[PDB]
Design a protein around this ligand. Sequence first.
Ligand code: A1EWW
Length: 394
Amino acid sequence: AEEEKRKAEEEKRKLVLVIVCVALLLDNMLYMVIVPIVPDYIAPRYPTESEDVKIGVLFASKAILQLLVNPLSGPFIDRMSYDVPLLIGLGVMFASTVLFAFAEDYATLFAARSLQGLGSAFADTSGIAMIADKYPEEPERSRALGVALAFISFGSLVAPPFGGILYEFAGKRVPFLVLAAVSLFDALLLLAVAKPPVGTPIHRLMLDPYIAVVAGALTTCNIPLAFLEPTIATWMKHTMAASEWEMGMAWLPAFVPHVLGVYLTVRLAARYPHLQWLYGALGLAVIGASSCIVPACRSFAPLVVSLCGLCFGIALVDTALLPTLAFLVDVRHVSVYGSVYAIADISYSVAYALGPIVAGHIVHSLGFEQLSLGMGLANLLYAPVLLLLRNVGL
Ligand SMILES: CCS(=O)(=O)c1cccnc1-c1nc2cc(C(F)(F)F)cnc2n1C
């Protein structure tokens, strides 16, 4: 009897995990392959440039619009379900992707990136929130958030070089239309599978110092990849004259230590459940080590190992603090997971919204090693700030 319904429920819950993680994979593929495509119109590819604030405000339009939406879309995920705002996010992401494949101007690209911001808020917060919801127990919550962040890192690291070599071979019409078709197939498959209490407000999560220090951790761990992603792809030619094939391929061996860091902290959170603050702090420590060591890496292979240490550190901090964030709102607040991952994406959003607007300007004014040592100083001075979470078992 009951074994059949239980294995069917675990089957459908694993299917929802796979469909949500593939949704996050394809969505981050969108956000990180439109970046080498945008400067080619407005007048072996590598994503970013460092010039033209008018284009940089387009690159940060996604992050500033999710920064403006998900404080209002946090309680939207709390009031309604998770599957309906995930469908709203994937629907506006389909509309965004066919708006990329539809036109080529500045205003339409700005509108498509803004719709990617709206879909980032809705779809990304709903996806991470229902991965936290459908895995209430802690060693499966950490492992499912690990698979989530592993496919997020897949779509954000190994997807931009192949998206670039599809833009150089096929173009922009056919790849974005078929990727929007695969995204609508994923959304309709989650409609076929999923079939879609009072909640705490978003103000009261900021008054919780534990949620506030995890939000500061996510801001300060995202801020090195925030300021270094529009910047390294012009520091290459200034430093060591990196080839264009070895240009956007620099984040491509940074996925393997990301998934090794994810696996390492899933192991060290299933073995040590109430010691995730130490792996968040150690993640921030190796973040500050990598950001301190990047301008010392004047050859290509040490730059690759420094950026893979950077993705290793963001993997440790994200996979050791996003289960801590849901566990923390579970044991200290009501057990609704939308607002607290809206706070997580607020941290993500303020990082990637201050990145492409003023990052290139403060590199052109101060320098590159000054910015890198500033962020490494921030992370070496913020890794002993995660010590406040030592009483999460108490
Ligand atoms: C090194 C981390 S990464 O995955 O490889 C990555 C690489 C390049 C650009 N961005 C990301 C990236 N980091 C995220 C963290 C979160 C969350 F806060 F939820 F943990 C959500 N989305 C993320 N994305 C898309």
